[PDB]
Design a protein around this ligand. Structure first.
Ligand SMILES: OC[C@H]1O[C@@H](O[C@H]2[C@H](O)[C@@H](O)[C@H](O)O[C@@H]2CO)[C@H](O)[C@@H](O)[C@H]1O
Length: 139
């Protein structure tokens, strides 16, 4: 029941081989339609673009996208992701040469083809209805 502040922001540097590990817990029950959002920004300003947007509608679906010149682009969705109601989760995002690889709770979930070079990602924001245990960037 320790937590980072939410919304949480940190500066980052991403390269091939890097891994973002996010651990926390939904802060509300699923019947309350809670959400989790992770945004990889290509700048440090409020109005910077988002190279990778990962949004969990707990109990319903996951959507992924990018924000480019202020426009949401092609939405990619996952019907089922194994987040458990009331349980802690572990989310990992690996930076590969051609895609981000998304892992949740020991399962491979998705490969998101890059739309922007990861070298341009400058900060990450993790927010909405979560308590956050830790946000680590490796390599
Ligand atoms: O694509 C990410 C983007 O989704 C918007 O919401 C979408 C919603 O996901 C979709 O089911 C519906 O058909 O259209 C909505 C508007 O495009 C969010 O508004 C936005 O914040 C992003 O999360």
């Amino acid at each position: 029941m320790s937590s980072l502040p939410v919304p949480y922001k940190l500066p980052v540097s991403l390269s091939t081989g890097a891994c973002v590990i996010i651990k926390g817990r939904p802060k509300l029950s699923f019947i309350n339609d809670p959400q989790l959002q992770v945004d990889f920004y290509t700048g440090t300003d409020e109005d910077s673009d988002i190279a990778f947007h990962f949004r969990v509608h707990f109990g319903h679906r996951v959507v992924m996208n990018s924000l480019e010149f202020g426009v949401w682009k092609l939405e990619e969705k996952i019907h089922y992701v194994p987040f458990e109601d009331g349980e802690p989760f572990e989310l990992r995002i690996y930076v590969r040469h051609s895609e981000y690889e998304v892992k949740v709770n020991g399962q491979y979930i998705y490969g998101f083809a890059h739309r922007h070079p990861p070298s341009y990602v400058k900060m990450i924001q993790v927010w909405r209805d979560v308590s956050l245990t830790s946000v680590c960037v490796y390599n």
